[PDB]
Structures are given as C-alpha cells and as structure tokens.
Amino acid sequence: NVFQTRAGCLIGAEHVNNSYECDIPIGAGICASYQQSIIAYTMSLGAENSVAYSNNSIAIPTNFTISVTTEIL
Amino acid sequence: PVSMTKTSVDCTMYICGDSTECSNLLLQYGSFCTQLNRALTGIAVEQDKNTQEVFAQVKQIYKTPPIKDFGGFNFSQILPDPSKPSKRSPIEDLLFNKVTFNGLTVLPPLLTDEMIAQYTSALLAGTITSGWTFGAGPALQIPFPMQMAYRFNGIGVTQNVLYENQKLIANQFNSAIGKIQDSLSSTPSALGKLQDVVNQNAQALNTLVKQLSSNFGAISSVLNDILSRLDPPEAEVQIDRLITGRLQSLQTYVTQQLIRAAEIRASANLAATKMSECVLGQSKRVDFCGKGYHLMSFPQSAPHGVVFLHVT
Amino acid sequence: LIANQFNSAIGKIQDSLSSTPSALGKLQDVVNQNAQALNTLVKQLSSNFGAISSVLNDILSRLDPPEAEVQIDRLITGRLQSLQTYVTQQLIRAAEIRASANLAATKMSECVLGQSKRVDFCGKGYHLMSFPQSAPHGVVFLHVTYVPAQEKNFTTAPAICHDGKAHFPREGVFVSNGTHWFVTQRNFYEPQIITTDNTFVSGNCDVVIGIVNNTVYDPLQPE
C-alpha cells in the first residue's frame, strides 16, 4: 500500500520480507519488481556461502568446462 | 574515488521559482533544460554504475570461519568487527571518520554504506580462505600459509623460504597492518583525493546557488519584487534578463558536472581494474599494485571511494 | 571432450545472441543518444527565443531591415546557443567513445593477439583465447576461458619429512586421499608418486610447521 523508504516514500507497492536481485532501482538498498502486483524489497547481494577452512584442508578440481562469453565495446 | 554525490537540479523551480509568467517566458527558449535534466539524471545513474562495477564483482557472499587461526597472520584490522553497530573493520571506521532549497535535490546512492561493507567483507573472506581461485570459478579452500607460498613462488622466490620464515613473515605483516592504521589516524591529509571530489561538488553547488542573487542587469535579483512592482508589459523585460542569466549559469554548472563525471568514471574504471587484478589475483605489472613485487591486496570501503592495502 | 565443449559453448553463445534483444544494448544506447541529440538540435529551430516568429522568411517578408534586425539577432543568439550546447555534448561523448575504443584496441591486442595473465581482463576465468567479431559501430569479443569444476576435499601438508630432510613440491602440491600421499598439479587432480624428481630438499624437519612423515621414492634404488 504505502511504504516509507530513505529515498522518499513509495505508493502503490507492497513491502515484503523477501529479498531478490534488484530489478528496478529505487535507492538506499530498496528495489522494486513486478511479480501479481508491484513489490518493494531490500536487494540481496548474492547467495550466502561459507567455504570450509582448516589449516590442512585443500580443494583441487578434478574436471573442467570451457566457457565462451561475449564482451561488446 | 569511485563515485560522487548524485545531484538533481530542476529548471522551473531554479530559474523561475513558482512564477507562472516566468515559466511562460521560459517556454520560448525551447527544450534547453529538458536536456539539462536529462544530463544530470544520466550522471546520477552513472554514479551507481561506477559503484556496481567496483564493488559488485563477486557473486556469493563468503564468510570467514568462526575460529580465526591463519598460521600467525591475523586480519583483525581488516575483518568486520561485530562489536560495533556498523559491521565495519576498524580501518574502515577510521576512514569513515576522517572524511568530512532552490530546486536542488540529492539522490541517495543505490548501495548503502552497509551493503558496500558487506561486499568488501565478502571479497576479504574470499581472498583469505581461497586465494585467487574464487575470482576464476568455484572457491577452493587453501591453507593461508600454503597460499602465501604460492604467492611467493609467483615472484621468483622458492616456497621453502616462506615455510622457513613463516612466523617472521607473519610478524612483519601484522606490524605493517598496524602501522597503516596509525599512519591514517595521525595524518589528516591522507584522504585528500576523496576530499577533493567532495569539496569540488560542494563549491559548484554553492556557486550555483549564489548566482541566484545576481541582477544580470535587471532592476532586482528577486523575481517576486519585479512581479510586485511592475505590470506584465514592462516586467517581462526584466524577467527576460533574469532568465538569460540563470539559464546560462545552469548550463555552466551542467557542463562542469559532465566533465567532472568523466573524470570520476575514469577513476572508477581504474579502481575496478585494480580490484580485478590486484585483489582477485596476483599481478605481474610493475607498480600497478604498489611498490615492490606484489603479493596480495585487501580492499577497504571509504565514503565515495575505495582504499587498497597492497601487501608487497 | 574439450572440442565438444568448445563447439557447444559457441552454439550456446550464438543462440543467446539470437534469442535476447537486450544483448547489444551498448551500441543501441550510443545510437539512441546521438539520434536524440540530433533531434533536439533540429527541434530547437522552432523556438521564437523572444522573436515575433520562429521562421526567418516570415520575419524577412513582413518587416523592414531596421526593425527586423532585432528579431533576427534574437533568433541568431538562440540558435547559436543551441548549436554550442550540441557541440559541447558531442565533444564529451566523443571523448567517452575514444576511451572505449582505446579499451577495445587494448583488449584486441592483449586477448586476441596473445594470451593474457590479467585477471578478468579477457573474460571470467583463466583466459585461454579470444575471437574478434565485427558489429555495427563496435566490436564483440568471444572470450574462451577455462573454468575448473568438480572439486573435492584433500588433506594437504606443506612438506614431506624423509631421512631427516624436508621435501617441498617442485611444481604441484602434496595431497592425501586418506591413507597415502601424492603430489598433484594445483589446477587439476592428477596424483603421482612422491619421488625425488618432482620434489626438492631444503633443510631438516625442525623448521617447517605441519610437516608430516612419508616415504620419498628414489628412481635409482631399483638398479
């Protein structure tokens, strides 16, 4: 309905607890996206990851992929 | 420096205020400040692009293990401090403490300082726990002394030197890390580069505001005085001079902002390159990642900028 | 397998370029900016700038020179100001495009004409090679890179103690599969027997921290 942010306030968007990749930047960590209505949330920087570290543990790849990507200039 | 403050300046409120007659006269000049508003908005978007390109280079948010024992090396000065209500490292806190209408608006940045600190923490944890692997695919854990042995091997020194002088090298690293904080705290001119950007933007805004009190040949610098003292057929003559002066001042401000934004974008591209090469890997380029043979780098967020700790 | 992966990657890249209209947004952005600047410059010709009319022919055929001079001067001032604004914007955009072109030339020199050790300069991963491709007012680089995958856990030691001496890996790294010890390259798991031709000796077993006991094979002992 009505949500108050740091970049002003937003009317017509439903504020949620969830977090997704930013779709429409609003500001101050707030982003909006269409799901069916318009939602406003706090953008997530990425999936949580915690690599297991000990003084004597190593990880070595056993297999590989050849990847081709495009860069436009 | 990475980004500068996002400023949005409105035509009709700055040149004419809330005067309908002045707006009707301003319509005769065409779409000059549709262009001006567009340029300022483009600069505002480019600032968020700069911050995204510098800090948002890693996908996952890596975390350091709860037990922090890296074979004598300790990163307490660069890892986030949970005691403070900011989740900033002590050096980041010192950096954040060292740096000090008329239609003008300041748009908040897309990424808050806490989110930039989370990005910096993710990069630091990835570098500590997996070396340069996490920047080129999956994050493969490696013991920190073994990683430093690889980095020693990467500059033409056999890895047995590090193993035979491990605790000495750890002591030297810790001492230099502490001296970085002492030098930053004891020198107020350390962060001059960021302060220059802040001062330049503030000076430009102050001059733009102070241009509103210039007569420009009119009988008065206040539009309400001209409206309250004259009839339309004579007041339009004075309002025309005021409009000309204020429009040309706004154009000067927009041009200066475009050039300075080009400066800042160049600096942000350089910062992104340094984060990709000095931090996510080991660089063979001379003097690109500090004096001496590069071993590693540690990023630190700063208000409107980035600070690299080049271990060499 | 590598050839099959390369061909599959090329096919996927072609399909992604074909099926996504937002892939080439940079060149489209440049074209749109230039076209819109030209449109604004042309539309500026329909503004009076305070004159009686925005058409020079009407002013000329309606007024005598002594009184039409003021209107012509106002039109000249407005149009000159618009043209100067357009020229300054074009100069700034041209500087940006020149910077982008210098970056593209550097990428062509370092990624295509050779192999680059710079991280993330020629694509994400360990750069193998690159292929240039022409685009309207631009260049598209196809970065072929090596991405490791399917890693697994190993117990590693900094050195191997044998005959009261410390052995360090010459090229790879010491790993353990649970009971035995091998030496393998860092970017690929190819375990091998720890011999004297893939390790070097430096000092005794009292200085290195975490050194473990194991037997170092000698290729000369059988004979």
Ligand SMILES: *[C@@H]1O[C@H](CO)[C@@H](O[C@@H]2O[C@H](CO)[C@@H](O)[C@H](O)[C@H]2NC(C)=O)[C@H](O)[C@H]1NC(C)=O
């Ligand atoms: C390394 O990766 C490739 C694919 O990236 C694997 O190839 C697959 O092998 C399985 C098992 O034979 C086949 O069913 C798939 O069709 C193969 N895929 C491709 C694209 O060729 C390969 O097996 C992996 N190597 C190992 C030892 O696991």
Ligand SMILES: *[C@@H]1O[C@H](CO)[C@@H](O[C@@H]2O[C@H](CO)[C@@H](O)[C@H](O)[C@H]2NC(C)=O)[C@H](O)[C@H]1NC(C)=O
């Ligand atoms: C990591 O180095 C830091 C340097 O700040 C050490 O932190 C200080 O440790 C002393 C005792 O050695 C305490 O009196 C201080 O209060 C500590 N400061 C802070 C901010 O915590 C830390 O002990 C070192 N860690 C290890 C494992 O040796």
Ligand SMILES: *[C@@H]1O[C@H](CO)[C@@H](O[C@@H]2O[C@H](CO)[C@@H](O)[C@H](O)[C@H]2NC(C)=O)[C@H](O)[C@H]1NC(C)=O
């Ligand atoms: C670790 O590797 C060693 C060496 O390859 C393995 O020992 C082999 O085990 C197989 C299966 O039992 C036997 O057929 C071979 O003769 C063994 N080789 C030697 C040289 O003894 C060992 O099983 C592996 N351990 C684990 C836990 O995978």
Ligand SMILES: *[C@@H]1O[C@H](CO)[C@@H](O[C@@H]2O[C@H](CO)[C@@H](O)[C@H](O)[C@H]2NC(C)=O)[C@H](O)[C@H]1NC(C)=O
């Ligand atoms: C690795 O082997 C060495 C010997 O090659 C072991 O060192 C022995 O340690 C015992 C117990 O302290 C002493 O009584 C012996 O005199 C030592 N021998 C030598 C030659 O120094 C060492 O303990 C072994 N390491 C492990 C972890 O078992």
Ligand SMILES: *[C@@H]1O[C@H](CO)[C@@H](O)[C@H](O)[C@H]1NC(C)=O
């Ligand atoms: C979002 O989460 C907080 C958790 O502190 C909760 O109190 C709040 O009600 C949630 N918002 C909505 C709209 O449910």
Ligand SMILES: *[C@@H]1O[C@H](CO)[C@@H](O)[C@H](O)[C@H]1NC(C)=O
């Ligand atoms: C290695 O073991 C750890 C133990 O916590 C586990 O989290 C991790 O997934 C394992 N790594 C691999 C590559 O399977």
Ligand SMILES: *[C@@H]1O[C@H](CO)[C@@H](O)[C@H](O)[C@H]1NC(C)=O
């Ligand atoms: C790893 O940590 C354990 C726990 O303290 C310790 O006993 C072991 O020696 C450590 N290994 C190395 C190589 O430092």
